């Protein structure tokens, strides 16, 4: 629109960054809904996901 005439809108966020942002938001949303569901309903009992980031401190 006047000031912003464009361009090459197909590849701007690159085709690599397209597949990237998909598989990123996919793992983030699957772990969101599924890991929470398993945690609040079944108490994180059948999963038991302690990854490695156990650096959960605030005041020792």
């Amino acid at each position: 629109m006047n000031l912003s005439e464009d361009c090459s809108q197909s590849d701007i966020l690159t085709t690599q960054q397209r597949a990237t942002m998909k598989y990123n938001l996919i793992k983030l949303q699957q772990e969101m809904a599924h890991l929470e569901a398993v945690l609040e309903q079944r108490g994180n009992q059948p999963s038991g996901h302690s990854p490695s980031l156990e650096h959960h401190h605030h005041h020792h």
Binding site: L3, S4, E5, D6, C7, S8, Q9, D11, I12, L13, T14, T15, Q16, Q17, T20, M21, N24, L25, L28, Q29, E31, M32, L35, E36, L39, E40, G43, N44, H49, S50, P51, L53, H56
Partner: protein
């Protein structure tokens, strides 16, 4: 300020709910924002409005793919 999500959760359940799902919620909206902003700006320099981002944690994924 914060929202007390997870009343009937024990020490480990509640530890994993807060820390895991907050990290995932952050990086969801975070990576989405970074790339969405980069997309719109680079196609055509438009007048940006609002973003809740403040403290950056050296985060970039600026890569390219051979055009086919």
């Amino acid at each position: 300020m914060e929202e007390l999500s997870g009343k009937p959760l024990s020490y480990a359940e509640k530890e994993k709910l807060k820390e895991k799902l907050a990290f995932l919620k952050k990086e969801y909206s975070r990576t989405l924002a970074r790339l969405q902003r980069a997309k719109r700006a680079e196609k055509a320099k438009n007048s940006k409005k609002a973003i809740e981002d403040g403290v950056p944690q050296p985060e970039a994924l600026e890569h390219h793919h051979h055009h086919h």
